């Protein structure tokens, strides 16, 4: 029985490999062998947002391209105003070990989580006039890696216990649980239509999930170590992965196959964060050697370098109109580049 | 304009209030020392926590020595894999490593864990305070026992007690020889790498003892002394 199961599994794996081999038709470089190089990209620091005490672990942009939220290991959550570098709110946290933060699209709620395995929601528009805790969500058996808002009443969470979950904030209950990874899940990103989402784990694999039914449709491999960043292309038909083997890759969902790999001989350090631009031509990544690289996705040749951080870069973000790039690092500073 | 200037002045007053609060919080924050506790299940790592009378899955203890506040953490609500959440503890003052020296069939795993911690990229500038617990059990095991440290370590038949060792008032020389052999095993891999950027402090402890917080306090004083020697151009 067990031997039959193993033989059957190997046979279906062979059939899947043959189908993928047949479906492959050409290379991305051959189709992209006529476009012009993007040109040298030069960016400078425009604002230096200072005020934190310890290393910054995450950040998120509000849906106005003006407001911002930052999370630090000192145990604070500061809401900035990028235009005037003015602090709006400073929320203390019960647990200092925070690993993620989010900003609701409406702008009335802010969520956070970390090593306490609990997701906390805070309200920004209160009649009394202070930010106060609104709801604590519990049920995960491992540290929280990422959390994203769908609506004002739903949220998606990923844990280090190899699971993802969908919540209902009003009643504080779980509606669907997604399982199937072997290692810890490190990041997730929602589709533009908020109906599918992808997640990368520490087993050198990524998976696509459908929010409603609660099943896995596609699984992607190709890396040789942990994946620690993921993001969605601005059209919802591809995504990008950064791993601990000092490489980046691009995956597509309608071909179920890897498309392009960015790497260099000198680079021997991993990738911590990955984000795209508005058009989909620039890929921004941060590395353990204290700097960020700007790759041209179509040509896969490095075209920009962002330097100025004195320690490891941990978080990267881009506005919803494409007017700024925010980078945080372990030197307790946040920098805006244009 | 009118409303623009009004909202701007309200914004600056709010910003200055927040900045004052942040200055106070920094004042409070920069005067507390953080420590990370590590060990195994058989080791009595929580036992020393309760031995110190002060005493979600994260156990936090606050104690105080000579008007200096220490905050210790124990992460015990996760899975076995720990190569991802340990990177959070990179700015910690020290790592307290507890070792079960009474048993032998699991000493090699403690050696491997210590060596893995020692050679990390984000933990190569953090000092480790080593506590070899369960000395009293070791005394009984070595004295009248059938198990031999020769079988697990075939290099124990050629090692003599170093001169600098200071025996206890009354103690079998064989007990001292073996108990210092374990320490030499742990210190051999701790001095074969590094450029004097971090040190290892060993101590012998039992299941009922009191002067442990003072040991950690003295080690923290030495660590800060080294950092200040580097900082104040006095090297």
């Amino acid at each position, epitope marked *: 029985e067990l031997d039959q199961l193993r033989q059957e599994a190997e046979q279906l794996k062979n059939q899947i490999r043959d189908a993928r081999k047949a479906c492959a038709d050409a290379t991305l470089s051959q189709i992209t062998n006529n476009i012009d190089p993007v040109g040298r990209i030069q960016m400078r620091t425009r604002r230096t947002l200072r005020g934190h005490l310890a290393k910054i672990y995450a950040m998120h942009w509000g849906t106005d391209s003006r407001l911002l939220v930052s999370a630090s290991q000192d145990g604070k959550l500061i809401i900035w105003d990028s235009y005037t570098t003015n602090k709006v709110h400073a929320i203390p946290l019960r647990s200092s070990w925070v690993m993620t933060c989010a900003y609701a699209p409406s702008g009335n709620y802010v969520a956070c989580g970390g090593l306490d395995n609990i997701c906390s929601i805070y309200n920004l528009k209160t009649r009394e006039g202070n930010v106060r805790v609104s709801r604590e969500l519990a049920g995960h058996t491992g540290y929280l890696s990422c959390c994203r808002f769908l609506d004002d009443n739903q949220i998606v969470t990923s844990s280090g216990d190899t699971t993802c979950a969908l919540w209902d904030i009003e009643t504080g209950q779980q509606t669907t649980t997604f399982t199937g990874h072997t290692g810890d899940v490190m990041s997730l990103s929602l589709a533009p239509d908020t109906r599918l989402f992808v997640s990368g784990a520490c087993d050198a694999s990524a998976k696509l999930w459908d929010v409603r039914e609660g099943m896995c449709r596609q699984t992607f491999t190709g890396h040789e170590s942990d994946i620690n960043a993921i993001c969605f292309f601005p059209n919802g038909n591809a995504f990008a992965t950064g791993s601990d083997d000092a490489t980046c890759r691009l995956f597509d969902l309608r071909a179920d196959q890897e498309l392009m790999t960015y790497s260099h001989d000198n680079i021997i350090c991993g990738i911590t964060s990955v984000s795209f631009s508005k058009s989909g031509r620039l890929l921004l990544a941060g590395y353990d050697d204290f700097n960020c690289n700007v790759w041209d996705a179509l040509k896969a040749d490095r075209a920009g370098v962002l330097a100025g951080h004195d320690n490891r870069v941990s978080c990267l973000g881009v506005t919803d109109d494409g007017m700024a790039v925010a980078t945080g690092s372990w030197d307790s500073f946040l920098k805006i580049w244009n | 304009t009118e409303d623009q200037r009004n909202e701007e002045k309200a914004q600056r007053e709010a910003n200055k209030k927040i900045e004052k609060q942040l200055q106070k919080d920094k004042q409070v924050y920069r005067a507390t020392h953080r420590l990370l506790l590590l060990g195994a299940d058989n080791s009595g790592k929580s036992t020393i926590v309760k031995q110190m009378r002060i005493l979600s899955g994260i156990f936090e203890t606050k104690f105080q020595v000579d008007k200096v506040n220490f905050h210790m953490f124990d992460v015990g609500g996760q899975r076995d894999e720990r190569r991802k959440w340990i990177q959070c503890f990179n700015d910690v003052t020290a790592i307290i490593f507890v070792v079960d020296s009474s048993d032998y069939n699991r000493l090699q*795993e403690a050696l491997n864990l210590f060596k893995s911690i020692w050679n990390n990229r984000w933990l190569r500038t953090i000092s480790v305070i080593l506590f070899l617990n369960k000395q009293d059990l070791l005394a009984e095991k070595v004295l009248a026992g059938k198990s031999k440290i020769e079988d697990y370590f075939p290099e124990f038949a050629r090692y003599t007690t170093p001169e600098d060792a200071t025996p206890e008032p009354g103690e079998d020389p064989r007990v001292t020889r073996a108990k210092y052999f374990i320490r030499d095993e742990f210190l051999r891999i701790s001095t074969a790498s590094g450029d004097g950027r971090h040190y290892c402090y060993p101590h012998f402890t039992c299941a009922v003892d009191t002067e442990n917080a003072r040991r950690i306090f003295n080690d923290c004083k030495d660590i800060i002394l080294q950092m200040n020697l580097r900082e104040y151009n006095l090297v």
Partner: nanobody
Amino acid sequence: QVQLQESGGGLVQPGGSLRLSCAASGFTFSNYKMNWVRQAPGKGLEWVSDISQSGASISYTGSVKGRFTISRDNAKNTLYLQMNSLKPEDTAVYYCARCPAPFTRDCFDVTSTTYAYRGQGTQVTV
């Protein structure tokens, strides 16, 4: 897809000889440290021996210090373990394990209950 498969093993008598050969695929073979682990009936996972990238530093556990010898073959992407004087205490399942990260001198999780880059194993009986 990272893949590692063991081969060899079998049945022997006390005081015998064996050669366990581990084949690998899916990654560059000369940037990673390699280890040998085994688990016996009624026991948990335990560590035996390890070898570095080039093949200079070699580490053993004491109980097999004078008997077994490790080797790596970068050209053929293979790992080898050589057996000698098999005392009736080695009957187990043997896994060849990879360090999680390249260009790295420490292996954190190799003996975990669940680990991604670990083989299926082969059974040796003495």
